[PDB]
């Protein structure tokens, strides 16, 4: 009964970071060695866990979050970071326990002319709390007069398209990111490594 990591990492389509995807991994045997022993990732950072010791560990549940961001934004998917992504799209807690895995996806997510399907929230009055997902498309009021759903002066559409083209500098190319959260509650452990 293997954990369906293949469904998460090898998904034909990833979510936009503002509407990041969460998959609750539970009741399965998890071989994390298929991930660590893979020359496919540019980023593989773990927090509160050793990456090689993951196969010895047992968790209540594991969460697999996934989205697409720029290469220069992958550094914001870590505890204690600021920026448009950490502040208005996907926020990790300071006591984060889990892994952050990223890889270049220029061959899949960039289009000759611009993709436009991948978005990010550009306007938000306040920063997100950790693991908050805001999918509101309400017109952003930058002044004193209400917008009333009409894009215009001091009334912006809150989301912005990435517009990924294969002629972008590496730090501006699309990157697929999978964040694995490790949950440890006073309840039975449903996700254990191979025994």
């Amino acid at each position: 009964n293997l954990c369906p990591f293949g469904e998460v990492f090898n998904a034909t389509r990833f979510a936009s970071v503002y509407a990041w995807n969460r998959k609750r991994i539970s009741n399965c045997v998890a071989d994390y060695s298929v991930l660590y022993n893979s020359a496919s990732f540019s980023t593989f950072k773990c927090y509160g866990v050793s990456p090689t010791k993951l196969n010895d560990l047992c968790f209540t549940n594991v969460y697999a979050d996934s989205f697409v961001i720029r290469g220069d934004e992958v550094r914001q998917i870590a505890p204690g970071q600021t920026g448009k992504i950490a502040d208005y799209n996907y926020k990790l807690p300071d006591d984060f326990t889990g892994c952050v895995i990223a890889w270049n996806s220029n061959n899949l997510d960039s289009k000759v002319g611009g993709n436009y399907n991948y978005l990010y929230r550009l306007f938000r009055k306040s920063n997100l709390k950790p693991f908050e997902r805001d999918i509101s498309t309400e017109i952003y009021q930058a002044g004193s007069t209400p917008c009333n759903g009409v894009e215009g002066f001091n009334c912006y559409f809150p989301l912005q398209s990435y517009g990924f083209q294969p002629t972008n500098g590496v730090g501006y190319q699309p990157y697929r990111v999978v964040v694995l959260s490790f949950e440890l509650l006073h309840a039975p452990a449903t996700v254990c490594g191979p025994k």
Partner: antibody
Amino acid sequence: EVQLVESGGGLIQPGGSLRLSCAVSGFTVSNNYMSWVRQAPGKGLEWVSVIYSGGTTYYADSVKGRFTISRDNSKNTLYLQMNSLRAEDTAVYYCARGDVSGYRYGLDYWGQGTLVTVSG
Amino acid sequence: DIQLTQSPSSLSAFVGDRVTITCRASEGISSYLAWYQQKPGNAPKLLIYAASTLESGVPSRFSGSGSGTDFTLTISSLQPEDFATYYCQQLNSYPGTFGQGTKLEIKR
């Protein structure tokens, strides 16, 4: 009628400190990306710093550790605290609405400017 | 870092001339580019944003085109009030580098 009014500039010796203010009307400072841009005499434009509505701040590498952008939501005013001023900091400083990284709108409204002269 | 090369440094023209100002980024910055106009003793004024979107209130004679590395600002019919310095700006990443500028002067 959007209006951005800078003040606080003037003559100061190298090593000194100065605070610029920018009283705004026409948009809410606390709800916008607000930037500081400067122009040395006879030169081009140079972005200095930005504050996000959420609180995040960024600076240009030439002003890091010496300048601090901030605001007062109640007075709809933006500030720039300039410490350890150097001769090169001599420029007209402009406050503008907008950001310069993944912000396609550019800097749509700018103040008249305030001249800061750093000289001994 | 991203370098923007704006050309020419100066351009000579008459009222009624079609003028094109060029801007070349060192890497693909898609449509993250703005165009500003500045007159001596005055703050810059935004003309075009998102590479080709005309800013509200700006006259129709100003237009921008391009995406990636090569951008252009066109002034289809110069008016007396258009003799000024023009700047391109990359809005892709900090520090939002501005171009060196193009002074548009009177032909003689």
